[PDB]
Nucleic acid binder design. Structure first.
Lengths: 125, 233, 204
RNA sequence: ACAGGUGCUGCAUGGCUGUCGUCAGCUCGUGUCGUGAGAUGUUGGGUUAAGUCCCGCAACGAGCGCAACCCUUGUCCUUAGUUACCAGGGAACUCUAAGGAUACUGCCAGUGACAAACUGGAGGAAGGCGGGGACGACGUCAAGUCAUCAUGGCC
């Protein structure tokens, strides 16, 4: 019953790791149904494949907030968090990948006088 | 100590002088002759002038006057530190600050800052302070100490100034000229002997001779100090 | 071109003059009442030398705190002057209000007091350079770490206005925790209006 | 009496603001030099986002800028657990909001005037300023504002 929290640029997700069949349920629904994007499915399964343990442990996932492609990354980071809490040895190799690094990029402020974070009104002679 | 023996100077090598091309006419009388494109200071003139300077410095030590020591040269500096520590007189060896005596009032604040840093080091102030701030403060301590360390206890203007390598120390000679305070200097052949109360025409490029001269001066000062004590008791 | 020091310093190292809580609708009227009280009190006490005023209004009765260099005259004889000012202040406002006076240990340290003195000097035609120098010197004698004085306008009746500033001491404006004291006053000289700016830095 | 004027004068002004420009610059005391305007410091070898620091040097120090302090996220901890959260009716987790903890070229290896520094490496959520914001120095443009408001003159 290991548990961990992973976030990606908005979202928080909570991951639960225990031995079992290895079926993955996201937000009380199947992962494949929950995610409509192959890329996000791949982000969700990115860490387990790295050390060839896709079905070793049962996964229970609940992820509120943020967006479609940020929730996948948050789930990945939570899976890494639970795996590192489980095992010390994996941490170095998982670090070499860097999946254990929380994303620090978030949507930045719009600076007044600028249309966007950095876009500036063009002037024509 | 008042009289400086002749043979030891010759063994030290004072008589050697700089090359002819850098020869200065004003020195001329002191230089007896030139051999192999090297000038030779005459033994008699230097012995007599050294005797007069020793008498003067012993006279000051009798009255407890404070005589500054200037040791800028890499060779002179270490021996000046050691001899000045024994003599009890202030010295500066690593570097000579521009306008030290003329602008001594400004230097008072730096001297006081060095003293209070030493006090806060003594009283254990480091423990309260952070490690990085303690380290940087200690580094500032060391940087100030190297320059002002010798003169910090002077607490005044020196009545007399003793200098080696007058040519390199010309700036201090100008400061002493402006103040009017007596200056005693060792002048090598190239160095200009002007604007000095007492001239000792000696080679300063030799570690051994520099040690000999500083040792003699310190011995004279010390003997003056015990002679002063005898009067008190 | 320079931000008001007090505004930036409010965040961390300073306490807001006005500290009252009100609901959105209540806020609009509460602020206006406070501003009216401040303006009327300033006009009434202009003759006296007064520092910045700290006003707290709770529901119903309001409470006012005033610090002045001269407490005696503002109190009056046995509180007579303060009682009259209080009755008028009750009339203008609602439920009876209470005002208390706190003595100031040193008038020179407070920025407003020195600027008021300089404004009176300019009104009485004392030379601006003399005014700035004496005002700055008094602070150094008092023990204030830093004082800076800037005068803008037609000093001496000159046709062309010019700005003269004098510093004596460290006055780090950009150090938010420098708790620098700033007040602005205007001197009504006959030839033209003169702007007086005073910066006082007591420390951290 | 006057009040009143969004009537004139921003080239009489106060206050506020743009600008060079968040560019790294602008100076002051004392000391020295020159008859003098003035020079030095503030230059020079290295280094930085920086007049950042370092070593020499007739300069020794200081101010004001730079940097720091402050706000906001990025990991973690304490506090409280409702109108939030339920992992199994509970308080573990998320979140919300008041505090601290961490990061400091700290550590390893190097290049380096035995120096400041820089180059790579470990750990960490974060590595060298971690990202963003606030802060706009002496002054330059008689730069914009008498129509926020204030005031001299004039009508």
């Amino acid at each position: 019953r290991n548990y961990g929290t992973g976030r990606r640029k908005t979202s928080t997700a909570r991951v639960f790791l225990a031995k079992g069949t290895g079926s993955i349920v996201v937000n009380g629904k199947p992962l494949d149904e929950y995610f409509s994007r192959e890329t996000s499915r791949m982000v969700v399964r990115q860490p387990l494949e790295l050390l060839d343990s896709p079905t070793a442990y049962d996964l229970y996932i609940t992820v509120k907030g943020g967006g479609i492609s940020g929730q996948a990354g948050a789930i990945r980071h939570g899976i890494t968090r639970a795996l590192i809490e489980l095992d010390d040895t994996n941490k170095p190799a998982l670090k070499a990948a860097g999946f254990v690094t929380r994303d620090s990029r978030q949507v930045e402020r719009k600076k007044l006088g600028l249309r966007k974070a950095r876009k500036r009104p063009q002037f024509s002679k | 100590p008042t009289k400086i023996e002749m043979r030891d100077l010759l063994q030290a090598g004072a008589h050697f002088g700089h090359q002819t091309r850098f020869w200065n006419p004003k020195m001329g009388p002191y230089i007896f002759g030139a051999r192999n494109k090297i000038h030779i200071i005459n033994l008699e003139h230097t012995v007599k002038a050294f005797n007069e300077a020793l008498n003067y410095v012993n006279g000051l030590a009798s009255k407890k006057n404070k005589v500054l020591f200037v040791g800028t040269k890499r060779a002179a500096s270490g021996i000046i530190a050691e001899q000045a520590t024994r003599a009890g007189m202030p010295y500066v060896d690593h570097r000579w600050l521009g306008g030290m005596l003329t602008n001594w009032k400004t230097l008072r604040q730096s001297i006081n800052r060095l003293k209070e840093l030493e006090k806060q080091a003594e009283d254990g102030t480091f423990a309260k302070l952070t490690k990085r701030e303690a380290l940087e403060r200690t580094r500032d301590m060391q940087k100030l100490e190297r320059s002002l360390g010798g003169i910090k206890d002077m607490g005044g203007l020196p009545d007399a100034i003793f200098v080696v390598d007058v040519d390199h120390e010309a700036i201090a000679i100008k400061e002493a000229k402006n103040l009017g305070i007596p200056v005693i200097g060792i002048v090598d052949t190239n160095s200009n002997p002007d604007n000095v109360d007492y001239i000792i025409p000696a080679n300063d490029d030799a570690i051994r001779a520099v040690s000999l001269y500083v040792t003699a001066m310190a011995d004279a000062i010390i003997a003056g100090k015990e002679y002063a004590q005898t009067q008190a008791s | 071109q320079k931000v008001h020091p007090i505004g930036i310093r409010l965040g961390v190292v300073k306490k807001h003059n006005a500290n009252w809580y009100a609901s959105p609708k209540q806020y609009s009227e509460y602020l206006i009442n406070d501003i009216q009280v401040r303006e009327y009190l300033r006009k009434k006490l202009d003759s006296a030398m007064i520092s910045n005023i700290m006003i707290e209004r709770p529901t119903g009765a309001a409470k006012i705190t005033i610090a002045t260099a001269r407490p005696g005259i503002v109190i009056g004889k046995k509180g007579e002057d303060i009682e009259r000012l209080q009755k008028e202040l009750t009339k203008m406002m609602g439920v009876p209000a209470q005002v208390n006076i706190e003595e100031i240990t040193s008038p020179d340290l407070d920025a407003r007091l020195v600027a008021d003195g300089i404004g009176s000097q300019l009104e009485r035609r004392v030379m601006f350079r003399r005014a700035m120098k004496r005002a700055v010197q008094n602070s150094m004698r008092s023990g204030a770490k830093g004082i800076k004085v800037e005068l803008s306008g037609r000093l001496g009746g000159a046709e062309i206005a010019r700005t003269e500033w004098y510093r004596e001491g460290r006055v780090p404006l950009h150090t938010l925790r420098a708790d620098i004291d700033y007040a602005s006053v205007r001197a009504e000289t006959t030839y033209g209006t003169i702007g007086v700016k005073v910066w006082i830095f007591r420390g951290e």
